[PDB]
Design a protein around this ligand. Structure first.
Ligand SMILES: [Ca+2]
Ligand SMILES: [Ca+2]
Length: 132
């Protein structure tokens, strides 16, 4: 875990306006707004690397309501597009969405869910995000 986090943090790409990392209170606000419980490991991801910019994928964030990756807006768009309400998007990819199950499994929903999945958000970060 420490390994993957370090890899992402050190690979962070500079941008004009740096992204902000949320605190626990901010995550609670998002959960309440969506009336859902964010899986623990997913919450850990948001609290440790959601300020990171890297590769060709831009995962969800919770600190800038005007961002195209703002979780509440991404959820609304994904759920309206067909993503099961029980799945919380972690990263948009075109019209597809990498989403997280209540138990933490990451799935890929094709504009139904495909056959590929990742054991955790960290597996996804290491094997998909860091490989982009
Ligand atoms: Ca299960
Ligand atoms: Ca599962």
């Amino acid at each position: 875990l420490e390994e993957v986090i370090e890899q992402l943090r050190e690979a962070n790409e500079p941008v004009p306006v740096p992204l902000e990392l949320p605190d626990e209170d901010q995550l609670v606000e998002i959960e309440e707004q969506l009336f859902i419980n964010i899986p623990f490991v997913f919450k850990e991801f948001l609290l440790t690397v959601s300020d990171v910019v890297y590769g060709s994928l831009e995962p969800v964030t919770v600190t800038d309501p005007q961002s195209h990756t703002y979780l509440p807006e991404v959820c609304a768009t994904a759920w309206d597009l067909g993503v099961p309400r029980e799945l919380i998007p972690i990263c948009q990819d075109g019209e597809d969405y990498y989403c997280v199950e209540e138990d933490g499994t990451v799935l890929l929903w094709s504009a139904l869910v495909t056959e590929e999945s990742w054991e955790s958000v960290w597996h996804w970060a290491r094997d998909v995000w860091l490989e982009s």
